[PDB]
């Protein structure tokens, strides 16, 4: 991205010479990055993050910078436009969170009373709100809230 | 219309009592629902004229209408109405004065404008001045008090005048005036400006030097109660005055006790408790009339002491407070009840969230029962009820206290129960206390009292009052278990009590339109009696049992009947239920249709226990009906019911394998579908595996091992990972059920070896099945396994590689001597594959038996240490995790070595060893608790100075420990706080920058540590705010507000969370907290920038607005310009 920005700054003169995928230098770089992400490479990275978040719920400390950068790259692509972010990680992440929370709730309610369940529900909701406000997009805040 | 109002006004001065009550009602109705100026003036004038009439009904109607009238009118009309009402209030006519006062009160209540309130307050201030008349003064005081209670926000620049006008009323000869002005001052204190409170306090302090006048103390108490947070700064000048005045001879200590209690309840922060504790103790003792309520106040004063304060429990116990409280138990009822309440509050506060409070309480227990013994002979029901409640509370707070006092307390209980004058409440309390004592005491100290406890219980059973009958039934049920406990051996001839206890119970079995609670209690008692004393009953056992069937039809006692049947079925004694089995089992099958989770579970458990205990007497008829309700019960919607159904099927197959050809209808299909359920986990998987194993052992046509394998792995040959795990585990369990399945392994090997005509799914499933089946059996006998496994390790996809590694790790557990060394040397052999092999080793330590792993520890440790220093970061992480997992075993042999490595180890070695111990922490208790607690000290304290990576890993480990187990960093938090605070500071030596034109980009090599420190600080808020100081904590946060975007959002969220915690500290510095925030919000996007920067700054601004909004819940907070004004509606 830094190289693309520098090149666009260098050749804006040529960028303003046509009459009319996209011809813009920044647009060309973003399209190239999107193409490089389309190949199965993403299937690893998008999958890898799913482990880290899970580890964050297992008492382990993970690196939030990597996930923040990955989410920023995903949201920036798709030319805000959130099509790729919505069809790539949003649905899978939401399904994984639903399944994990359902399993945890079932396991807890199987051998614990309701007061403890309420307390851990508060804890998990607060942790989820923290995660959303830290390293997730604002538009998803409501989506994962209700 | 105009004519309507005209004729209404014309008929309003009608001279007929009933024509002036209809017009007013019509006007009120028309005004209530949603009018020219002349009409408004005319109607207002008519209403004012009619306000004074010779009839009460019309006057009351006009007064009521005055309220809604002001709701829809201009300001001048309200002003003139108020003026005329105030002028009339000065008239000498009592009726007119009362009418005006009521109208003004109604107008004030109707209101939520400002000029009207100012004029009213001015008029009251002028009128309240010293005057001969008292009625007008009282009316004005009442109006002012009502206005203050309703409105207390406006009139900021009028408080001094009100205070000055009200002060002279304090010394009024009428006590009513003094009380009214005290109440008015207390109400006005809430409204106020802030500078007036200091003047009022100073005036009261200087006026305290007075003769015998209790008005000042009453006013002080009232203002303290109305506002305690604004008076805590002047206690040093008030406490000495009351302390010195307590020496007076006249009986006036009541006010001092009341104000002390109010201060204790409201103002918690103070250190003058012992100064007044002795005074209260001596005051409660003296007695010589008007001397009882002073004692009552002294006794009640200790209620706040015993309730609010809790850290001072031991000093209460060691002091003479409880001793005096127990000693003063033979006084009049009014003070005795308050003493009982105070000691009950103390006992309640004793229960928490050298010697512990419980041990000290027991030492005084012998001094309590005796003190209550005489109280058991009192004829007052209140004293007996208080004693019973005290005994119940004492037994509840700690069991095993009244062990050597049953002989002296039982007679009192019997005497109280046998008393005819005892009320229903007293009997209920006595029965509850007896039940609590029996349920929280050893049965061995109740046998001699059976003869004295059975007659009264039986007598209480025959009581028209239903609650007493229920209590007696519960006591009988408890005594049934206490007399003949099946958990421990006993030797006591209870046969003489078999008849009467039954007679009082069976008589209650026949409900015949009785209370539901009574029916439930009787059913429970009958079930308990049948379960415990089932052999003693003779010919009366069967017939009564038949009545249970009548209870299975109605839904009122269905759950209770099912629970009783389940309890009866499971018991050491052999009870014959066959006569009610054929007619009982089908009815239970009808309870699975209606949607009732509790009922479904109860009936399933009852059927399971009945089949397990009674398997010889069974018929296929009822079994078929029962099996029909299973298919709609095994589903992914509910997991608890699925496990119960699986267990029931397993039990039925185990004790009745004949009826296994009917489940093939839909039960097998449902089980197969549930096997691939993503939510399948927990005990349900184990239950299903056990059911499959039992089915394989039994054996049935079309349900053989080959058929089961084909049905399970049928669709795969012709999607969720948990489904693959479940299928592999089921295959492994089925293979284990048959110890001779040689062909299966060779077939799986052939299928896996054939790359062609075998997609990734089949290979993954085969590898998972091989790994699952190779754990509990040894596969070293068959060759060609290592070669194919190693060949499969190299594949394009990663899922297959991970599955192969997991399978190899699981298989290595089987034959450790033959597999562990092979992988150990293979790790060093190839450098391009060890990264996978190491992962397999991670399973061994987590899957292999520790006793069997003892011999192969030194080699693994040496390999890990040799591979600890590696260029690859992933390999370093893997070896660190392996070392951490291995550190769990024999900690006493490894911990000293780890401590030693920190004295001369390298940076990489230190990082690896500190990372290894990070994973040792677990949420649940572990046997390495004290060892880790003692070891983590030097790890956390003296290992953050030298290096950067070492600092980062230490901070990460500290954060992980705080998140999982914060008790380890509880005693050393202060010892590490300086280092953590220092690490938060930014370093400009570790910030590199490269510039190649107008653009600029800054790279920071130390930003990772700052993020870890901030995360640790945030996570420390869980259960450590009570220890760490606030002032020294928020300075670094204030400095860090101006930091990186991620840190900025984290700090904003910290501030949002801090809004509900210690708001006083946040408010004391809001100015400097928000100043950097305002500076950031006043930032502008750099010109000629990509949309990414615009969006990033937009989210930063929204987060800042959310933070300030949360904090708000006036340093130039009104800065809403043209554009920003459109932002807030998007945030809220």
From Swiss-Prot, chain A:
Origin superkingdom: Eukaryota
Tissues in which the UniProt entry reports expression: Expressed in lung fibroblasts.
Modification after translation (UniProt): Neddylated; which enhances the ubiquitination activity of SCF. Neddylation prevents binding of the inhibitor CAND1. Neddylation leads to structural rearrangment in the complex that allows interaction between the E2 ubiquitin-conjugating enzyme and the acceptor ubiquitin. Deneddylated via its interaction with the COP9 signalosome (CSN) complex.
Domain comment quoted from the record: The Cullin neddylation domain restrains the RING domain of RBX1 in the E3 ubiquitin-protein ligase complex; this restraint is removed upon neddylation of the cullin.
Function: Core component of multiple cullin-RING-based SCF (SKP1-CUL1-F-box protein) E3 ubiquitin-protein ligase complexes, which mediate the ubiquitination of proteins involved in cell cycle progression, signal transduction and transcription. SCF complexes and ARIH1 collaborate in tandem to mediate ubiquitination of target proteins. In the SCF complex, serves as a rigid scaffold that organizes the SKP1-F-box protein and RBX1 subunits. May contribute to catalysis through positioning of the substrate and the ubiquitin-conjugating enzyme.
Subunit structure: Component of multiple Cul1-RING E3 ubiquitin-protein ligase complexes commonly known as SCF (SKP1-CUL1-F-box) complexes, consisting of CUL1, SKP1, RBX1 and a variable F-box domain-containing protein as substrate-specific subunit. Component of the SCF(FBXW11) complex containing FBXW11. Component of the SCF(SKP2) complex containing SKP2, in which it interacts directly with SKP1, SKP2 and RBX1. Component of the SCF(FBXW2) complex containing FBXW2. Component of the SCF(FBXO32) complex containing FBXO32. Component of the probable SCF(FBXO7) complex containing FBXO7.
Family in the record: Belongs to the cullin family.
Protein name: Cullin-1
Organism: Homo sapiens
Source organism phylogeny: Eukaryota, Metazoa, Chordata, Craniata, Vertebrata
UniProtKB/Swiss-Prot annotation, chain B:
InterPro entries, alphabetized: ARM-like (IPR011989), ARM-type_fold (IPR016024), CAND1/CAND2 (IPR039852), TATA-bd_TIP120 (IPR013932)
Source taxon at top rank: Eukaryota
Keyword list, A-Z: Acetylation, Cytoplasm, Nucleus, Phosphoprotein, Repeat, Ubl conjugation pathway
UniProt HEAT repeat ranges: 1-34, 38-75, 77-112, 117-151, 157-192, 193-229, 230-264, 315-352, 357-400, 404-443, 448-485, 496-535, 539-576, 579-616, 621-658, 662-701, 703-736, 737-773, 780-817, 818-855, 856-888, 889-926, 930-967, 971-1025, 1027-1061, 1068-1113
Phosphoserine modification, residue list: 491
Broad class of where this protein is predominantly found: cytoplasm
GO biological process, one term: positive regulation of RNA polymerase II transcription preinitiation complex assembly
Gene Ontology molecular function: TBP-class protein binding
GO CC term (a single one): nucleoplasm
Induction or repression: Repressed by miR-148a.
Subcellular location: Cytoplasm; Nucleus
Positions of post-translational N6-acetyllysine modification: 49, 899
Known function: Key assembly factor of SCF (SKP1-CUL1-F-box protein) E3 ubiquitin ligase complexes that promotes the exchange of the substrate-recognition F-box subunit in SCF complexes, thereby playing a key role in the cellular repertoire of SCF complexes. Acts as a F-box protein exchange factor. The exchange activity of CAND1 is coupled with cycles of neddylation conjugation: in the deneddylated state, cullin-binding CAND1 binds CUL1-RBX1, increasing dissociation of the SCF complex and promoting exchange of the F-box protein. Probably plays a similar role in other cullin-RING E3 ubiquitin ligase complexes.
Note, other: A model has been proposed to explain the mechanisms of cullin-RING E3 ubiquitin ligase complexes assembly. According to this hypothesis, cullin-RING E3 ubiquitin ligase complexes exist in a 'stable' active state when saturated with substrate, occluding access to deneddylation by the COP9 signalosome (CSN) complex. The neddylation-conjugated cullin-RING E3 ubiquitin ligase complexes mediate ubiquitination of substrates and can recruit downstream factors involved in substrate degradation.
Family: Belongs to the CAND family.
Known partners and oligomeric status: Interacts with TBP. Part of a complex that contains CUL1 and RBX1. Interacts with unneddylated cullins: interacts with CUL1, CUL2, CUL3, CUL4A, CUL4B and CUL5. Does not bind neddylated CUL1. Interaction with cullins is abolished in presence of COMMD1, which antagonizes with CAND1 for interacting with cullins. Interacts with ERCC6. Interacts with DCUN1D1, DCUN1D2, DCUN1D3, DCUN1D4 and DCUN1D5; these interactions are bridged by cullins and strongly inhibits the neddylation of cullins.
Name of the protein described by the UniProt record: Cullin-associated NEDD8-dissociated protein 1
Species whose genome carries this gene: Homo sapiens (Human)
């Amino acid at each position: 991205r830094f190289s693309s920005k520098v090149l666009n700054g260098i050749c804006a003169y040529l960028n303003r010479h046509w009459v009319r995928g996209i011809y813009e230098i920044y647009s060309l770089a973003l399209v190239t990055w999107r193409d490089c992400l389309f190949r199965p490479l993403n299937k690893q990275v998008t999958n890898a993050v799913l482990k880290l978040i899970e580890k964050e719920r297992n008492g382990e400390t993970i690196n939030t910078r990597l996930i923040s950068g990955v989410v920023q790259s995903y949201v920036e692509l798709g030319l805000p436009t959130l099509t790729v972010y919505k069809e790539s990680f949003e649905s899978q992440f939401l399904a994984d969170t639903e399944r994990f929370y359902t399993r945890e709730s079932t396991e807890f309610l199987q051998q614990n009373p309701v007061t403890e369940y309420m307390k851990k529900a508060e804890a998990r909701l607060l942790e989820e709100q923290r995660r959303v406000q830290v390293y997730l997009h604002e538009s998803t805040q409501d989506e994962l809230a209700r | 219309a105009s004519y309507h109002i005209s004729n209404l006004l014309e008929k309003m001065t009608s001279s007929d009592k009933d024509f002036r009550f209809m017009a007013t009602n019509d006007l009120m109705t028309e005004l209530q629902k949603d009018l020219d100026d002349d009409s408004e003036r005319k109607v207002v004038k008519m209403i004012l004229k009619l306000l004074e009439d010779k009839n009460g009904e019309v006057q009351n109607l006009a007064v009521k209408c005055l309220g809604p009238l002001v709701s829809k009118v201009k300001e001048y009309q309200v002003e003139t109405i108020v003026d005329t009402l105030c002028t009339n209030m000065l008239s000498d006519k009592e009726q007119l004065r009362d009418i005006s006062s009521i109208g003004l009160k109604t107008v004030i209540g109707e209101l939520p404008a400002a000029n009207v309130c100012k004029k009213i307050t001015g008029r009251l201030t002028s009128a309240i001045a010293k005057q001969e008349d008292v009625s007008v003064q009282l009316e004005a005081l009442d109006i002012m008090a009502d206005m203050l209670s309703r409105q207390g926000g406006l009139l900021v620049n009028f408080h001094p005048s009100i205070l000055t006008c009200l002060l002279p009323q304090l010394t009024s000869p009428r006590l009513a005036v003094r009380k009214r002005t005290i109440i008015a001052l207390g109400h006005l204190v809430m409204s106020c400006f802030v500078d007036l409170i200091e003047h009022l306090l100073s005036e009261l302090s200087k006026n305290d030097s007075m003769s015998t006048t209790r008005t000042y103390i009453q006013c002080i108490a009232a203002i303290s109660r109305q506002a305690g947070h604004r008076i805590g700064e002047y206690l040093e000048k008030i406490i000495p005055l009351v302390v010195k005045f307590c020496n007076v001879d006249d009986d006036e200590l009541r006010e001092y006790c009341i104000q002390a209690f109010e201060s204790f309840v409201r103002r918690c922060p103070k250190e003058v408790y012992p100064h007044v504790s002795t005074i209260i103790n001596i005051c409660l003792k003296y007695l010589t009339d008007m001397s009882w309520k002073v004692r009552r106040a002294a006794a009640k004063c200790l209620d706040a002491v015993v309730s609010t304060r809790h850290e001072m429990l031991p000093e209460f116990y060691k002091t003479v407070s409880p001793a005096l409280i127990s000693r003063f138990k033979e006084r009049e009822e009014n003070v005795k009840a308050d003493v009982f309440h105070a000691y009950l509050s103390l006992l309640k506060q004793t229960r928490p969230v050298g010697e512990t409070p419980l041990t000290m309480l027991q030492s005084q227990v012998p001094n309590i029962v005796k003190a209550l013994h005489k109280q058991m002979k009192e004829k007052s029901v209140k004293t007996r009820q208080c004693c019973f409640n005290m005994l119940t509370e004492l037994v509840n707070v700690l069991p095993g206290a009244l062990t050597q006092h049953i002989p002296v307390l039982v007679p009192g209980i019997i005497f109280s129960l046998n008393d005819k004058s005892s009320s229903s409440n007293l009997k209920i309390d006595a029965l509850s206390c007896l039940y609590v004592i029996l349920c929280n005491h050893s049965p061995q100290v109740f046998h001699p009292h059976v003869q004295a406890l059975v007659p009264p219980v039986v007598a209480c059973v025959g009581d028209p009052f239903y609650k007493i009958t229920s209590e007696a039934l519960l006591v009988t049920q408890q005594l049934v278990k206490v007399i003949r406990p099946l958990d421990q051996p006993s030797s006591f001839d209870a046969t003489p009590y078999i008849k009467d206890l039954f007679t009082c119970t069976i008589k209650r079995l026949k409900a015949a339109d009785i209370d539901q609670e009574v029916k439930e209690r009787a059913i429970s008692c009958m079930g308990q009696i049948i379960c415990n004393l089932g052999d003693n009953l003779g010919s009366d056992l069967p017939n009564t049992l038949q009545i249970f069937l009548e209870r299975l039809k109605n839904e009122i006692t269905r759950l209770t009947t099912v629970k009783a049947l389940t309890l009866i079925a499971g018991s050491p004694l052999k009870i014959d239920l066959r006569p009610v089995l054929g007619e009982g089992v089908p009815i239970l099958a009808s309870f699975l249709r209606k949607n009732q989770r509790a009922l479904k579970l109860g009936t399933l458990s009852a059927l399971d226990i009945l089949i397990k205990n009674y398997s010889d007497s069974l018929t296929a008829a009822m079994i078929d009906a029962v099996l029909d309700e299973l298919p709609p019960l095994i589903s992914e919607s509910d997991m608890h019911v699925s496990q119960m159904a699986i267990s029931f099927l397993t039990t039925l197959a185990k004790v009745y394998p004949s009826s296994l050809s009917k489940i093939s209808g839909s039960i097998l299909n449902e089980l197969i579908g549930l096997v691939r359920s993503p939510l399948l986990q927990g005990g349900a998987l184990s239950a299903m595996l056990d059911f499959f194993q039992a089915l394989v052992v039994t054996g049935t046509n079309n349900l053989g091992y080959m058929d089961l394998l084909r049905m399970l792995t049928g669709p795969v040959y012709s999607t969720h990972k948990q489904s693959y795990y479940s299928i592999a585990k089921c295959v492994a369990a089925l293979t284990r059920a048959c110890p001779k399945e040689g062909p299966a392994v060779v077939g799986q090997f052939i299928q896996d070896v054939k790359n062609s005509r075998s997609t990734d799914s089949i290979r993954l499933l085969a590898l998972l099945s091989l790994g699952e089946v190779g754990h509990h059996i040894d596969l070293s006998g068959q060759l060609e396994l290592k070669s194919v496994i190693l060949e499969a390790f190299s594949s394009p996809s990663e899922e297959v590689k991970s599955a192969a590694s997991y399978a190899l790790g699981s298989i290595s557990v089987g034959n450790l001597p033959e597999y562990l060394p092979f992988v150990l040397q293979e790790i060093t052999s190839q450098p391009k594959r060890q990264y996978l092999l190491l992962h397999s080793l991670k399973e061994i330590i987590s899957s292999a038996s520790v006793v069997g792993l003892k011999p192969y520890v030194e080699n693994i440790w040496a390999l890990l240490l040799k591979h600890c220093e590696c260029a690859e970061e992933g390999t370093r992480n893997v070896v660190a995790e392996c070392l951490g997992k291995l550190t769990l075993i024999d900690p006493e042999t490894l911990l000293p070595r780890l401590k030693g490595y920190l004295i001369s180890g390298s940076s990489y070695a230190r990082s690896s060893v500190v990372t290894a111990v990070k994973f040792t922490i677990s949420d649940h208790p572990q046997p390495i608790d004290p060892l880790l607690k003692n070891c983590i000290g030097d790890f956390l304290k003296t290992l953050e100075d030298p290096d950067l990576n070492v600092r980062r890993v230490a901070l990460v480990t500290f954060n992980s420990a705080a998140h999982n187990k914060p008790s380890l960093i509880r005693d050393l938090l202060d010892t590490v706080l300086p280092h953590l605070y220092n690490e938060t500071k930014v370093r400009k030596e570790l910030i590199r920058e490269v510039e190649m034109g107008p653009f600029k980009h800054t790279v920071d090599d130390g930003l990772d540590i700052r993020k870890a420190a901030f995360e640790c600080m945030y996570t420390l808020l869980d259960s450590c705010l009570d220890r760490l100081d606030i002032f020294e904590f928020l300075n670094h946060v204030e400095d860090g507000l101006k930091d990186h975007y991620d840190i900025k959002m984290l700090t904003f969220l910290m501030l949002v969370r801090l809004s509900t915690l210690c708001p006083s500290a946040v408010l004391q510095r809001l100015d400097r907290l928000v100043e950097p925030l305002r500076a950031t919000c006043t930032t502008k996007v750099k010109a000629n920038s990509v949309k990414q920067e615009f969006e990033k700054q937009d989210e930063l601004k929204r987060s800042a607005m959310r933070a300030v909004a949360a904090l708000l819940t006036s340093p130039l907070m009104s800065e809403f310009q043209s554009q920003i004004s459109s932002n807030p509606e998007l945030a809220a």
